[PDB]
Design a protein around this nucleic acid. Structure first.
Ligand SMILES: [Mg+2]
Ligand SMILES: [Mg+2]
Ligand SMILES: [Mg+2]
Ligand SMILES: [Mg+2]
Ligand SMILES: [Mg+2]
Ligand SMILES: [Mg+2]
Ligand SMILES: [Mg+2]
Ligand SMILES: [Mg+2]
Ligand SMILES: [Mg+2]
Ligand SMILES: [Mg+2]
Ligand SMILES: [Mg+2]
Lengths: 149, 70
RNA sequence: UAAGGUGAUAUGAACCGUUAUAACCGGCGAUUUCCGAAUGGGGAAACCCAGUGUGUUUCGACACACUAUCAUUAACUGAAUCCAUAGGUUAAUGAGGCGAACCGGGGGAACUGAAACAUCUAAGUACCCCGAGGAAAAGAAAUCAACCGAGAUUCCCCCAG
RNA sequence: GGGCGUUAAGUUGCAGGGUAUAGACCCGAAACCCGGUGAUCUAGCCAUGGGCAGGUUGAAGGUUGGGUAACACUAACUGGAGGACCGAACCGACUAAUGUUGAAAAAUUAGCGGAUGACUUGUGGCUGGGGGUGAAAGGCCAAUCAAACCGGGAGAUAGCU
RNA sequence: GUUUAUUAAAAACACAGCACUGUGCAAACACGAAAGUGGACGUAUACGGUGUGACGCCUGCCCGGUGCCGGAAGGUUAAUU
RNA sequence: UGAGCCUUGAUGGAAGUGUGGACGCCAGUCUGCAUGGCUUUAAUGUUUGAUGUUCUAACGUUGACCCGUAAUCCGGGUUGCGGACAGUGUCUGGUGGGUAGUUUGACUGGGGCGGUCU
């Protein structure tokens, strides 16, 4: 009933909770690979230095990552046919790769970990919408299309 | 048999009834495994209760710094 | 130490000795086949079969010598996975088995008695298992006392059947 | 007033009478409990090998000739059944005599049942005692079985001889 | 048809038939510390367990008692607080 | 949707015409809103118990594949399916002959059956 997230994730706490938290939930998931926590003397005081010492990021860092929606919008139509066939369906797999990898059809590269589409995309050939989600502070816009061969 | 972290038990006793049974009782505790070590990753110890709850106030590390050392 | 002496059931033969390396006694050694923890592998115990090195070599061989398994450390190698570990090899130490009783400890009866029998007794005895010593074991108050005080543990007689 | 007391010498040895706790005058069960040894007999089963003169009868099915419009029907030949026959080896034991301090701790003699099968046999293996195995009799588990043998608790207990 | 080899051959065991129940296959179930094996080189018209009773003709009435199967509304009711 | 604290209300910016919920011994008052010149008890904050919604994040995997490894165990890894469920620990209400705890006299013409024990 005592932890320190700091990297809030839908939990009733941000920058790490200092009062009664959940228990047995972190023993196998939260702590491992996720956001380590131990709100025990040692780890506690060590977090104060990360805060009592506190920003140029909101002015500068935000800018070195906000031009996303502006750098990629006027883009030429994405022409990556996903093997449209089967009497009116397809053969190609549409998920994470062809969405992001649709940028290096000339050179530029991205990270498959920024896509914004709750539901998986229906294996069609129409105007595949792609709302690029680089960071929470800034969102962008992309598209995808399938052809016959 | 194990409960490694803590000793164990398996000591016998007589299970009396209404006055008396000169029978015998024994085997207790239990088991479980697969414990994720903050370090590399889990070797499955077969601790039990009083062993599992022990790995809590304690560590996971010191709770193992013995089944190795000694 | 010494005039004898070559163990015994039987001499006998062939001998060794009398001064001081003949016996004989005591100490330290040398040797010490095969089996047996048995340890190179196997095996109905005293047998069978190999690898890798050796000397003399009329230079095939004879025998010899090393090679079990674990643990500690050392270095070198080293997977799934960069790492790192797991694993592997080598080497030096060490263990292993016997052992009468006493001793610490883990497990632990029943006949028997109770004039029956379940509580209870026998008895933590018998026994079985592990361990260590020459003895083992125990051994400086979060002890006791009772308003006085004693002062670690241990063993003995009382308190008391 | 009445009960119990009040000018009863005790105490410590020694020897003895008795009592108490102890075995407990001696010999003896049928049994219970603990730990080991036994499937070289026997009962099952597993693996791998062997045996069946021994001899007879000879069903169903089929081939062919005949024959029917087609079959049935039939004749031979082949075929090979059966809680089938007699039948040696082999396996087993229904009857009688003998034996009964035997030739023999279950047999001998004359007959008797099965004898290609749920058959029979060699070698080795697997089931362990409250347990095994059992075409079932409480049968068999080494001349032992309503709970094996060996050692222990053990000098069990014995109001009995 | 089978049975107490060695005092019981039966009305007892078995039987074909019937019913209940379990098992979706690495089946249930059984032997086995395990590996593995049987079930079965089968697969629900199959396999197991329980009870009733070769082949033929059959197998009647009773669910009060006990057992089992279903229901589970209501009564009684453990630890627990 | 209950209940605890208790936060704001009804008992114990200056007139008139009106709308709503309140209850009755009933003939009535209560109480927000335009124009006009402490307890009985309700709402919001909550704390906490209930059902029901949705989410991932528990850990599961007696699925597959790769090493350790010429292993059916185990461990690591990849992958899949499940997923904050399952399951476990503490606590707690059920149920609970599944199990347990609660000896069987004497007298006697042996004993037992019978009979009798004041
Ligand atoms: Mg040698
Ligand atoms: Mg060996
Ligand atoms: Mg008495
Ligand atoms: Mg005694
Ligand atoms: Mg016994
Ligand atoms: Mg034969
Ligand atoms: Mg026979
Ligand atoms: Mg003659
Ligand atoms: Mg039979
Ligand atoms: Mg039988
Ligand atoms: Mg008998």
């Amino acid at each position: 009933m005592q932890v320190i997230l700091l990297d809030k994730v839908a939990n009733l706490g941000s920058l790490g909770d200092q009062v009664n938290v959940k228990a047995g939930y972190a023993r196998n998931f939260l702590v491992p690979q996720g956001k380590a926590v131990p709100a025990t003397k040692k780890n506690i005081e060590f977090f104060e230095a990360r805060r009592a010492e506190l920003e140029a990021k909101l002015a500068e860092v935000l800018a070195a990552a906000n031009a996303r929606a502006e750098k990629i919008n006027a883009l030429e139509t994405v022409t990556i046919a996903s093997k449209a066939g089967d009497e009116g369906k397809l053969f190609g797999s549409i998920g994470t790769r062809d969405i992001a990898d649709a940028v290096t059809a000339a050179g530029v590269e991205v990270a498959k970990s920024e896509v914004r589409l709750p539901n998986g995309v229906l294996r069609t050939t129409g105007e595949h919408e792609v709302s690029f989600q680089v960071h929470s502070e800034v969102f962008a816009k992309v598209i995808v299309n399938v052809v016959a061969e | 048999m194990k409960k490694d972290i803590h000793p164990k038990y398996e000591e016998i006793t007589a299970s009396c009834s209404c006055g008396n049974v000169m029978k015998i009782r024994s085997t207790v505790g239990h088991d479980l495994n697969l414990d994720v070590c903050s370090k590399c990753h889990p070797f499955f110890t077969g601790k039990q209760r009083d062993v599992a709850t022990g790995g809590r106030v304690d560590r996971f590390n010191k709770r193992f710094n013995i089944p190795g050392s000694k």
